[PDB]
Amino acid sequence: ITGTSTVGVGRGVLGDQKNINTTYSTYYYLQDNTRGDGIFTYDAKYRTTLPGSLWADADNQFFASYDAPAVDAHYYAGVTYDYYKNVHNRLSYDGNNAAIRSSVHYSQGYNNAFWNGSEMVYGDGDGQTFIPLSGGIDVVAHELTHAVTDYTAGLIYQNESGAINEAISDIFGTLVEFYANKNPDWEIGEDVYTPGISGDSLRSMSDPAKYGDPDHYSKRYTGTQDNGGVHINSGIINKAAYLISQGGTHYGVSVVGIGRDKLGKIFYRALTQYLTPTSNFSQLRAAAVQSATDLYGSTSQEVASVKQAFDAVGVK
């Protein structure tokens, strides 16, 4: 829509108040013109046709409970866009400022969120397993990082490449959560997963085995479910990424952590310059070693920690 940029205020899924960038033209729309070619949020109105209607509001105030998921989708897409721009110098997911689109209230009782190839889609949850999925900044950044992967390495969504694709999304979703300093942690989806239980989450990067995911290459899932285990075997990479950052001893192998910032520089580099559509875990290891080598030198501590981390999860 063509109109005047302005700022509205609302409340997100967890009840927190925030300012959001809106556009005025008769109504106030959720259209942020301050970032790239824009961030646009749509109402799918409980249907599955996409994208739905650009979200329109009469007074620029978004405190209705129906508004909550739109507020957070719109706001967290802007925070993810800022993370990629400021930290990695990348302009939107394609690197050329592509418009970012999201639809909320997709279907009824839908317990998922996803990047479909052209935009982000978020269900409201059934209210028991999940509350509206856009309330989780790690979930929003996870889905938006799939768009980044799609335009760069192009990892196919199955078997080891799909597991890497998923791990990349959990790593950058977590790094975005630390960037916004929103009670950060190494768990995924804990702000929106099971509102009746405290403490749990969908997946853990610091201890994937907590929920039954593998944390070692010898425990990988080799069946056919979940497209060959893309959400299961990602735990091996997540654990390696946690160790590179934080350090620790895992199955007897000691890793000195080098921190989150270096972790994000090494993996962003591996992702945008060395990973290809069919890369497997062993190729991920070699891409990560080469990336740290490029950035810090072959006899740096950084290269040494990437190697120990992959040795600790059994990836050679």
231 is catalytic: yes
Please tell me whether residue 301 adopts helix, strand or coil conformation: helix
Task: Give the one entry of Ca ion, Zn ion, none that residue 169 binds, where binding means its C-beta sits below a cut-off of 5 to 8 angstroms depending on kind.
Answer: Zn ion
Total residues found in the chain within this entry: 316
Burial of 30 (0-12, 13-18, 19+ CB in 10 A): buried
Contact between 5 and 34 under an 8 Å Cβ cutoff? The reply is yes
**Which residue in 143, 160, 250, 302 is the catalytic one?**
143
Cβ distance to Ca ion smaller for residue 109 or 195: 195
* For the chain, counts of helices (H) and of strands (E): 8, 15
| 193 annotated as ligand-binding | yes
Angle at 130 (CA atoms; ends 126, 136), nearest 5 degrees: 140
To Zn ion, the closest distance from the beta carbon of 170 in angstroms equals 8
Please report, as ranges, the residues that interact with Zn ion according to CB under 5 A: 166, 169
| 88 annotated as ligand-binding | no
Q: Using CB under 5 A, which of the segments 103-111, 162-170, 189-197, 207-215 binds Ca ion?
A: 189-197
Identify the DSSP state of 127: S
What sign for the dihedral angle of Cα 266, 260, 116, 81? negative
Residues 50-69 that bind Ca ion (CB under 5 A): 57, 59, 61
51 preceded by a cis bond (ω within 30 of 0):
yes
Task: Give the one entry of Zn ion, Ca ion, none that residue 138 binds, where binding means its C-beta sits below a cut-off of 5 to 8 angstroms depending on kind.
Answer: Ca ion
Using CB positions, name the residue nearest to Ca ion.
194
Residue of 197, 218, 222, 316 that binds Ca ion (CB under 5 A): 197
Task: Give the one entry of Zn ion, Ca ion, none that residue 57 binds, where binding means its C-beta sits below a cut-off of 5 to 8 angstroms depending on kind.
Answer: Ca ion
Q: Using CB under 5 A, which of the segments 77-85, 191-199, 246-254, 300-308 binds Ca ion?
A: 191-199
Q: Return d(Cα 269, Cα 53) in angstroms, integer.
A: 37
End-to-end CA distance of the chain: 52
Identify which of 133, 103, 138, 97 has the alpha carbon closest to the alpha carbon of residue 121: 103
Ramachandran assignment for 197, one of left (phi > 0), alpha (psi -120 to 50 degrees), beta (any other): beta
Task: Give the one entry of Zn ion, Ca ion, none that residue 294 binds, where binding means its C-beta sits below a cut-off of 5 to 8 angstroms depending on kind.
Answer: none
88 is catalytic: no
Q: Using CB under 5 A, which of the segments 18-26, 91-99, 181-189, 300-308 binds Ca ion?
A: 181-189
Task: Give the one entry of Ca ion, Zn ion, none that residue 226 binds, where binding means its C-beta sits below a cut-off of 5 to 8 angstroms depending on kind.
Answer: none
Instruction: Give the position of tokens 């998922």.
Output: 112
Site track 124-153 with Ca ion (rule: CB under 5 A), x = hit: --------------x---------------
Q: Cα 60 vs. chain centroid, distance in angstroms? A: 28
CB contact set of 143 (below 8 Å; sequence gap of 6+) = 113, 114, 115, 120, 169
Give me the half-sphere count of Cα atoms (radius 13 Å) on the Cβ side of residue 261. 3
Site track 90-129 with Ca ion (rule: CB under 5 A), x = hit: ----------------------------------------
Cβ distance to Ca ion smaller for residue 187 or 302: 187
| 200 annotated as ligand-binding | yes
Cβ distance to Ca ion smaller for residue 17 or 61: 61
Cβ distance to Ca ion smaller for residue 57 or 207: 57
Q: What residue numbers does the annotated binding site for Zn(2+) cover?
A: 142, 146, 166
Which residues are the active-site residues? 143, 231
